[PDB]
């Protein structure tokens, strides 16, 4: 489940994160924008 409007990167350092262009954010949190 990925929301169109952020890019995501699942890094093997044991943490995946989503970047929102709409709010300018880098976060572990699952995007609510998605619904």
């Amino acid at each position: 489940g990925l929301p169109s409007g952020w890019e995501e990167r699942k890094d093997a350092k044991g943490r995946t994160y989503y970047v929102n262009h709409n709010n300018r954010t880098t976060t572990w949190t699952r995007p609510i924008m998605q619904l």
């Binding site: 890019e7 995501e8 990167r9 890094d11 350092k13 044991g14 943490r15 994160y17 970047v19 929102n20 262009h21 300018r24 954010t25 880098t26 976060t27 572990w28």
Partner: peptide, 12 residues
Amino acid sequence: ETPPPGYLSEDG
């Protein structure tokens, strides 16, 4: 957990 990489820099 060591935190997030800076915002909007995405190597694809």
